[PDB]
Every structure is written in structure tokens, then in C-alpha cells.
């Protein structure tokens, strides 16, 4: 596992010793090389895991997330290359350093043999993204967004530290292998109920759960493109990964403690989707769609069945890729219009046809069209919920319907109709943006050919 961590750490001296006009080239090249190296982790076993050492290990659940995290950084660099043109070399190096540190923290977070180390790195990731949002942010509300994003997560995660140290003092270890092998049932007690709440709330606040999702539209609107990319693709999956790992010790309490949350998601995935129908901002619309998808993932995790787990993993990967693509598209529009409103730039398919094709493919992926992995995860979770209770389908069906609607809404308002007359600074699309979209979309349709790589360890 060190063969991935060490080059990521070496990315920092490379960036700081690079020429004043070559930082982007070397950063992108070596990030892509690190992604190629990390591709080896996909080789998994039907047995326990690949236990590299006493400190790190990999699984069929950590492997897709690690590969996605390593693949993200070149895309973030290409996205951030444009709007940082008038920046001093030292500050560009600081920005690249923040991105590299965030990737390193996520890489060592997703392996994490021991729960306290996982918590340490999972809380360490809060700093680079907070600095990115509050420093390289366009609007004056970036400070409030940073405060919200920091304090929601810290309030959720502070009881988790107490719960984890209490676990280590009682059972004796926090190593995940020993935790799984020496697992014992949880008695129905008030102490155990608060134990469950402390262990669960920290991850459920970052998914985000409906009603605890107020921070996400703010942190998405006020962040730069790289911040929105990283927080929509991987940083949302930290909560899902945490719940998937930690639920092994919460049984059989979860059978009846999950009821308040399931409802909050089952209704919430509807409500936010309806919110997407009436939105004047592209970024807010995509943020609310992300909230809906992550609510469905929460339902899948709380159901706690094999099909639920595989569907949740596939949905996490697919949602990350699609959300990053959509935010790239929105940022490309913003860099031309500088407005970030839906109704100003209209009829863009007349002006940018290939970008219209990219919009169509992104919307179709978000619409969960077969045989894309989005639909694979969605269908697996829907079937598992149907087995959980035959009535759930109703809500599920409604959400699916509404989903398609708003997706096509986002496709029709921005690309069809009559172009706005007074916007004439719509330059033809660069090769950089088109390459970014192609590198976003081709992995999705390639993963569609081999779903077993993203179906988790329960495949």
C-alpha cells in the first residue's frame, strides 16, 4: 500500500521544486501515473482481504473508492487550470498542495485497519477542503459555508471519539478484523441506544441525511470547481464507507433503531427531488440531486442485506462520477456567463453542439438509463427495499419519475429553445474542457462492461 502513499507524498516536493510554468503538466502526468499504479488494487479475492501490513489493508469495498480518489486528482487539476490563470506561483503551488494533501488523507482513510486511525484521518480531511472553500472562493458567503461545513461534521464526529474509545476500553481492540471476528450482539439498553446514536450520527451527518443536509448546498455553491468536484465525488462517500464498516457491531439493535432514519431518507429522497424541480441555480439543483441519491444510499445501508450493500457501492461510484461531470459542465457555463443562474444562458445547443452531447450523456447517466451502473445500483437497492417491505416501491417509483423530470429539465432549459440575444461572449469550447468530459464519461460506460469490480465485497 506504501507504493501508492509514497508517490502521493513525493508529489509535494515535485510541485514545490517545479518550474513556474510547468506545475500543471508534471502534476497531471504523475497523478495519472499514480492512478495507473493504483489500478492494481482492483484484483480482489473472495476471501477476507489483502492485508498489506498491521496498519493498512484493502478490500473489495475500499478498492473502487481508492481508484476513484486517485483518478479524481488529474481531473481536478484540469478543471482548476482555467480560473487560476492570474494567480501567483506560490499560491498555485499552495492550491496544488492542498489537493495533494486531501488525496493523501483520503487514501490513508480508505485503508485504515484501525478505527481510531480512520477517525483521525477522516477528521484531518476537513482542513484542506475548508481552506480550499474559504480561501479560493468567489462569493462572500464562503466563510459561512466553511463554518457550516466544519461545525456540522465536528458536532457529529465528537461523540464518535468517545464511542470509539469506550469500545476499545471494553472490548479491547479497534482493529477491524478482530472487531468482525469477536463481534457480539448488543443488548436492548439505553446505554446501547446512545452508543448506537454516537456511532451512527457522525457518518450520517456527512452523507448527508435529510434534515442534516443544510450545509451541502452552501458548501457546493460557494466552493470552487475542484472543491465541488472532490466533495461531490469522494467526500460524500466517507459517511457510507463508515457506516458500512461500523454496522458490524451495532446488531441486533439496528433492526429497530433504523426506523427514524429510514423514513427521513424515504421521504427525503422524494422531497429534495421535488426541490430540484424549482431551482434557479444549476449548482443548487445538482447538490439537491446528490442529497436525494445519498438518501437512497442511506436506505440501502440501513436495510443491511447483501443486495442492498452491492447496490449502495455501485450507486456511490456512479453518483460520484456523474455528479463530478455535471459540476464540470456547470462550471464551463459559468466561466462563459459568470452568472450561475439557469435562465440566463439558453439555447446553448445551437452554439456548442459537442457540449450539448456531453450534457445529454450526463443527464442520461443521472436519469439512470440502462445498462449504466447507476441503474444497476438503483435497481438493486429498489429490489432489496421491496423485499424489506412491498410498499416502499411506491415512494421509490415516484422518486425515479421525478428524477427523470428534473434531469431533462436541466437539459431542456439550458440547451434547447432560442438563444439569449445579449450574450455574445460564448467562445467555442476548448479542447481541455472536452477532454475533461470524455475522461469523465468513458470510465462509466467502461465500468458498465465489468460491474463486478464495483459491487463490493458481498458480490
Amino acid at each position: 500500500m506504501l507504493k501508492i502513499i509514497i508517490p502521493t507524498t513525493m508529489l509535494l516536493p515535485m510541485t514545490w521544486m517545479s518550474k513556474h510554468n510547468m506545475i500543471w503538466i508534471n502534476a497531471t502526468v504523475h497523478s495519472l501515473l499514480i492512478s495507473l499504479i493504483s489500478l492494481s488494487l482492483l484484483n480482489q479475492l473472495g476471501e477476507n482481504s489483502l492485508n498489506f501490513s498491521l496498519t493498512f489493508f484493502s478490500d473489495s469495498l475500499s478498492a473502487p473508492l481508492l481508484v476513484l480518489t486517485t483518478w479524481l486528482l488529474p481531473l481536478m487539476l484540469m478543471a482548476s487550470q482555467s480560473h487560476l490563470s492570474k494567480e501567483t506561483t506560490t499560491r498555485k503551488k499552495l492550491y496544488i498542495t492542498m489537493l495533494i494533501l486531501l488525496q493523501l488523507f483520503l487514501i490513508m482513510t480508505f485503508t485504515a485497519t484501525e478505527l481510531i486511525l480512520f477517525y483521525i484521518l477522516f477528521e484531518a480531511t476537513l482542513v484542506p477542503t475548508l481552506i480550499i472553500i474559504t480561501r479560493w472562493g468567489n462569493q462572500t458567503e464562503r466563510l459561512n459555508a466553511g463554518l457550516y461545513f466544519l461545525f456540522y461534521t465536528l458536532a457529529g464526529s465528537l461523540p464518535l471519539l468517545v464511542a470509539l474509545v469506550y469500545i476499545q476500553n471494553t472490548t479491547g481492540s479497534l482493529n477491524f478484523l478482530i472487531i468482525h471476528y469477536w463481534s457480539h450482539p448488543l443488548s436492548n439498553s439505553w446505554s446501547n441506544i446512545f452508543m448506537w446514536l454516537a456511532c451512527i450520527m457522525a457518518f450520517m451527518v456527512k452523507m448527508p441525511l435529510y434534515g442534516l443536509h443544510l450545509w451541502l448546498p452552501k458548501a457546493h455553491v460557494e466552493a470552487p470547481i475542484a472543491g465541488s468536484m472532490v466533495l461531490a465525488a469522494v467526500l460524500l462517500k466517507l459517511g457510507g464507507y463508515g457506516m458500512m464498516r461500523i454496522t458490524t457491531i451495532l446488531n441486533p439493535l439496528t433492526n429497530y433503531m433504523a426506523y427514524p432514519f429510514l423514513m427521513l431518507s424515504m421521504w427525503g429522497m422524494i422531497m429534495t427531488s421535488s426541490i430540484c424541480l424549482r431551482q434557479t441555480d444549476l449548482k443548487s439543483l445538482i447538490a439537491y440531486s446528490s442529497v436525494s441519491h445519498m438518501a437512497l444510499v442511506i436506505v440501502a445501508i440501513m436495510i443491511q442485506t447483501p443486495w442492498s450493500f452491492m447496490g449502495a457501492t455501485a450507486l456511490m461510484i456512479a453518483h460520484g462520477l456523474t455528479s463530478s461531470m455535471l459540476f464540470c459542465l456547470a462550471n464551463t457555463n459559468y466561466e462563459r456567463v459568470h452568472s450561475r443562474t439557469m435562465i440566463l444562458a439558453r439555447g446553448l445547443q445551437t452554439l456548442l453542439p459537442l457540449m450539448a452531447t456531453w450534457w445529454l450523456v450526463a443527464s442520461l447517466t443521472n436519469l439512470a438509463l440502462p445498462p449504466s451502473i447507476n441503474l444497476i445500483g438503483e435497481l438493486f437497492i429498489i429490489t432489496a427495499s421491496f423485499s424489506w417491505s412491498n410498499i416502499t416501491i411506491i415512494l421509490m417509483g415516484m422518486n425515479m419519475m421525478i428524477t427523470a423530470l428534473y434531469s431533462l429539465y436541466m437539459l431542456i432549459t439550458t440547451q434547447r429553445g432560442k438563444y439569449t440575444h445579449h450574450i455574445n461572449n460564448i467562445k467555442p469550447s476548448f479542447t481541455r474542457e472536452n477532454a475533461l468530459m470524455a475522461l469523465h464519461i468513458l470510465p462509466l460506460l467502461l465500468l458498465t462492461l465489468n460491474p463486478k469490480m464495483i459491487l463490493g465485497p458481498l458480490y
Binding site: 429534495t272 424549482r278 452491492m310 445551437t350 445498462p371 425515479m400 427523470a404 423530470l405 431542456i412 429553445g417
Partner: protein
């Protein structure tokens, strides 16, 4: 070995070559439409062979070639079913598509993006073939979604028009409403039968419960535009004529009836679901015929005719006659496609004019279109020894001789009468009167592409019904003996509708003006179904999406509870704690108080 499998897969394989060549140089020239049309014709003539082999022997095969994945005890693999339905529907669909593309090479000559149009037509054809030949529910769902998304892309062909966009979104909406039931059926089948493969579903379900068949019926109603979800099919006329002629008249729409046919062994074991199917078909056909009676746009009239035919096919499904419904699918393909082609030829000849009020005497000005439309209307109305005879007459016979609803029987009889009536309306108002178009006459059919495309389907609508009926093996117990009055009831209601419609249209020459009756108004606005059902629910959703969803809950109360209360409490406590004047008097007084409290309290 066994050329059946090789040829059946080769047709689908070669149907996809121009899609791969879409990035090659031929896509940037004007020869691409001819290339795609030639590919389609070759595919049809190649597919003609497995049908012949089945006709000789009765060959059926399943081909599970590629193994996609395995999920514990479930196995998902790329499997094609090539039974009678597939090997019969493929040649008909390919023939209809070939005629439609040859027609479109003339109709869409002035469109700058004609290669994209042909590319889209071919993509829709591929997705339809995938849907038809599918052996498991996942592949069938893939085709189900592909045809729908291709219809969305083709309806909104002119994206600069608001009405095209809203019509495409409406079609997507209704098809997703059907998709809810489709997904419910898929979940039920995999939960209970533990497989999506058709063979296991057939084995493990001897007495199919209500829920999976309810889901299948909902999906079929959504995609076939039944009474509950009808308006999308007539509103889908915003697209080009070639698209409407093939996608919405004879191929994509029959997807729901085909799905119900695929699961006919399970449908016959449920008596309630068959009753619901019959009732839904009857209401669909009568409502659509009533609407088509008074419509004035030719395309809308033929769309309502197609909806009525689909309702009649669902009625056939209800009385447990699936093979008859498939035969009616095959015949309706031919004559409905020809009717749409003739209509589009008239519109192109009259400078993009669709209303029948501004088109008069074309009977002599454009004879080939007139005779083709006359033959198509005769076949549609059940003229004996024609293509529509062998299906529709047997439908009427079987519905009249079965233990079914009396209301449904009356409903289909009235629907047949109204079908004759609106066919007469089309002919009378489009070919018989005096001309009513602008003085500048641009009428011309002298184009070999259009003539050949029309005449191929015209020969089809004359002979294919007889050929297919005489070639397929028997599939149902025939009705040999009939009471004489019940035997001719189809012809009787046909001529009754003809005579009554002709008498009613003859009175328009009278110099009498009377305001329209209440019943007539109801028929013109489509029972007011499009109005209220497109104004009341949508509004009552969207307003909530702004009021309860975003402002009240997300922007007001969820912000009030956690963040704002905490901030207010902390600010107030900070103000109380820090607000000291800096006097050591009060400081040491508090020191003394806390000293005495500690002394007297913790010991």
C-alpha cells in the same frame, strides 16, 4: 450448423454497422441515408430466411451467448429468444422501417441534419430489436428505455420549438409512470421466482398472483397509451412525419401489447387481471375513437386511430387470444404506416399544411396518394379479404363469442362504427370536395422514392394478411359455427358507421349555421382530459416544491432548529458571561459566595 441462430444474430449485428461508421467519412457526405437504407433492406432480406425455416418446421431457440455477471444464485447473461413472435415481428418491422426510410429520403431532403435523422432512426430500430428479442427482464428493460429515450430525442427534433420539447417531456413522463409498474414486476419476480430469465418465471409460477401482472399491465398501459395515460401519443405529433409514421404508428407503441403477449402463460392463470385488461382496452378504444371523430388535424386523427387499434389489441389480450393480437399487430403495422406516409405526402405537397379545412379536392390532383389512402382505409375498416380483415374480423368474432363483459362488447362495436366514421371523415374532407388551398399550386408526386415506398406497403396491405394467415400454423380453437346475425355484426356496424358518417358530413353543404352541441365540444377537447390533467396536478405539485419543499422546511425551519438556535444561545451566553465592568468589588464578593458554597455543599 443450424443457420437459424447465425442468421438471426447476423441481422441484429449488421443493423449496427452504420452506427459504428457514424464517425467515418461517409457520415459527412450526402450518401449516408442511402447507405443506411441499403443496410436496412439487406437486413430485412437476410431476416426473411429464419422466418421461412420456422414456417417449414417450427424452429424455436434460446441463445445465451455472453454471461454478464452472477449474483449469488442469480445469473444474468446476454440471452436472445427467437420464438415465433420474434422471427415474425422482425421481418415486418424491417420492411416497415425500410419503407419509412425510403420515404424520409424524400420528405426530409431540405433538413440540414438529415444524416443525424437517419442515425437516430437506425438507433431506434436497434433498440426495438433488442426489446423484441430479449429473453430476460433486464434486456427487455434496456430496450424499453432505449425506445423511449429515442422517441424523446426524435419528437424534439426541432429543439427551437417549445411545443416539441414539452411533448417530448410529456412522453417521458407517461412512460416513466409505466416504468414504475415495470420495475415493480422486476422486483417481485426476482424476489419470489429468484430469476429474471423467462424460463424460470414460467416454471415457478403456475398460479401467478395479482401484483406482478398488475405491474406488467401498468407498464403496458403506459407504453401503449391506454385510457389512463393516452394523451402523450396524440401530443407526440410535434415530431417529423417519418418519425410519427414508424415510431408512433406501427412499431414502438405496440411494445406494451407485445410485453403482455410475452407473458401470456401467466396471464391466462389470472382471471381478475384479464378482466382489467379487457375493460381498459374497451375504454381506451372507445374514448380514442370518440376523440378522433371530430378532430381536424390529419396527423392527430391518425394518432387517435392508432390509439384505438392498440385498445382493440388490448381487448383481444383480455379475452385470452394472444396470437390474434400479434396478428393484428402485424397487419396494423402495414396499413397504419401506409396511411401516415400518404398523409405526410399530402402535407409536403400542400406546403406543410396539416389542417383538413384548407385542403379540398385531391382525388384527381394526386391520384396515387388517393388510391393508396383509399386502400389503407378499406383495410383498416375491415374490408373482407384484405390485410385488416384476417385480424379485425376474428377479433370481433372472438369478443362476441366469449364469457366477457357486455359493456366491453358494446364498446368495441361502437368503436368499430366510429372507426368507419372517422375513415369516411378523412376521405370526404381530404379528397372529395372542392380545393381550399392557396392559389399557388405546388402539387407533385412524381418522385420515384415516394412512389416505390408507398407501393411496397400497398402490395403488403393487399396480400400480406392472406399470406401470413395461410402460412402460420393454427394457434387457437376456431369459431366454426355462428348465428347468422352475429357473424355479420362487424360488417353491419361498419356499413352503419359509413352511412351515418356520410349523411352527417353531407349536411355541411347546407346554408345553415348552428352552434355546436355540448356533446360535440366534449369530444373536441378530448374529454377535457388534457386540460385539467395537465393543469391541476402539475401546479399542485410545483407550488409545493417551492413552498413546503424549499422555503418552509429547508430554508426556514431546518435552519431554525439546529444552527440558529445554537448560535443564538451561544451568543446570549457569551454576552452574559463577558459583560463585566471590571470592578474587583463584585469579583471578591462572588469569590466569598463561592467559597461559602464550596464549604457548605461538597462536604
Amino acid at each position: 450448423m443450424n443457420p437459424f441462430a447465425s442468421l438471426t444474430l447476423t441481422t441484429l449485428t449488421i443493423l449496427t454497422i452504420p452506427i459504428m461508421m457514424s464517425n467515418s467519412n461517409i457520415y459527412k457526405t450526402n450518401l449516408y441515408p442511402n447507405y443506411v437504407k441499403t443496410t436496412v433492406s439487406y437486413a430485412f432480406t437476410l431476416s426473411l430466411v429464419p422466418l421461412l425455416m420456422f414456417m417449414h418446421t417450427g424452429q424455436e431457440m434460446i441463445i445465451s451467448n455472453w454471461h454478464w455477471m452472477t449474483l449469488q444464485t442469480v445469473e444474468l447473461s446476454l440471452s436472445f429468444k427467437m420464438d415465433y413472435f420474434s422471427v415474425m415481428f422482425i421481418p415486418v418491422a424491417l420492411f416497415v422501417t425500410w419503407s419509412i426510410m425510403e420515404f424520409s429520403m424524400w420528405y426530409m431532403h431540405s433538413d440540414p441534419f438529415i444524416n443525424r435523422f437517419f442515425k437516430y432512426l437506425l438507433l431506434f430500430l436497434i433498440t426495438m430489436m433488442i426489446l423484441v428479442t430479449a429473453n430476460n427482464l433486464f434486456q427487455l428493460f434496456i430496450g424499453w428505455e432505449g425506445v423511449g429515450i429515442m422517441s424523446f430525442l426524435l419528437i424534439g427534433w426541432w429543439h427551437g420549438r417549445t411545443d416539441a420539447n414539452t411533448a417530448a417531456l410529456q412522453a417521458i413522463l407517461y412512460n416513466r409512470i409505466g416504468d414504475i409498474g415495470f420495475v415493480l414486476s422486476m422486483a417481485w419476480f426476482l424476489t419470489h421466482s429468484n430469476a429474471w430469465d423467462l424460463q424460470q418465471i414460467f416454471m415457478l409460477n403456475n398460479e401467478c398472483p395479482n401484483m406482478p401482472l398488475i405491474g406488467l399491465l401498468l407498464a403496458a398501459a403506459g407504453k401503449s397509451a391506454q385510457f389512463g395515460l393516452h394523451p402523450w401519443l396524440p401530443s407526440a405529433m410535434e415530431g417529423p412525419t417519418p418519425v410519427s409514421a414508424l415510431l408512433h404508428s406501427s412499431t414502438m407503441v405496440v411494445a406494451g401489447v407485445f410485453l403482455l403477449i410475452r407473458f401470456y402463460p401467466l396471464m391466462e392463470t389470472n382471471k381478475l387481471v384479464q378482466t382489467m385488461t379487457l375493460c381498459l382496452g374497451a375504454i381506451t378504444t372507445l374514448f380514442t375513437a370518440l376523440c378522433a371523430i371530430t378532430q381536424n388535424d390529419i396527423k392527430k386523427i391518425v394518432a387517435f386511430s392508432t390509439s384505438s387499434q392498440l385498445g382493440l389489441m388490448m381487448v383481444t389480450i383480455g379475452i385470452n387470444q394472444p396470437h390474434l393480437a400479434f396478428l393484428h399487430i402485424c397487419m396494423h403495422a402495414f396499413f397504419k404506416a401506409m396511411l401516415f406516409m400518404c398523409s405526410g405526402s399530402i402535407i409536403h405537397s400542400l406546403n406543410d399544411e396539416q389542417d383538413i379545412r384548407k385542403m379540398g379536392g385531391l382525388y384527381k390532383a394526386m391520384p396515387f396518394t388517393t388510391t393508396a389512402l383509399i386502400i389503407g382505409s378499406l383495410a383498416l375498416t375491415g374490408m373482407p379479404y384484405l390485410t385488416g380483415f384476417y385480424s379485425k374480423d376474428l377479433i370481433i368474432e372472438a369478443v362476441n363469442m366469449s364469457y366477457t363483459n357486455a359493456w366491453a362488447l358494446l364498446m368495441t362495436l361502437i368503436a368499430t362504427s366510429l372507426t368507419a366514421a372517422y375513415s369516411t371523415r378523412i376521405i370526404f374532407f381530404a379528397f372529395l370536395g372542392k380545393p381550399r388551398f392557396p392559389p399557388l399550386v405546388l402539387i407533385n408526386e412524381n418522385n420515384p422514392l415516394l412512389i416505390n415506398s408507398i407501393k411496397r406497403l400497398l402490395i403488403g396491405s393487399i396480400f400480406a394478411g392472406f399470406i401470413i394467415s395461410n402460412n402460420i400454423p393454427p394457434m387457437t380453437v376456431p369459431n366454426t359455427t355462428m348465428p347468422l346475425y352475429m357473424k355479420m355484426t362487424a360488417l353491419i356496424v361498419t356499413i352503419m358507421g359509413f352511412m351515418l358518417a356520410l349523411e352527417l358530413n353531407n349536411t355541411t353543404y347546407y346554408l345553415k349555421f348552428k352552434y355546436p352541441s355540448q356533446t360535440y365540444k366534449f369530444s373536441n377537447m378530448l374529454g377535457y382530459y388534457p386540460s385539467i390533467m395537465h393543469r391541476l396536478p402539475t401546479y399542485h405539485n410545483l407550488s409545493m416544491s417551492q413552498k413546503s419543499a424549499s422555503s418552509l422546511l429547508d430554508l426556514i425551519w431546518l435552519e431554525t432548529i439546529l444552527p440558529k438556535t445554537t448560535s443564538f444561545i451561544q451568543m446570549k451566553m457569551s454576552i452574559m458571561v463577558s459583560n463585566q465592568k471590571g470592578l474587583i468589588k463584585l469579583y471578591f464578593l462572588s469569590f466569598l459566595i463561592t467559597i461559602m458554597i464550596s464549604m457548605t455543599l461538597f462536604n
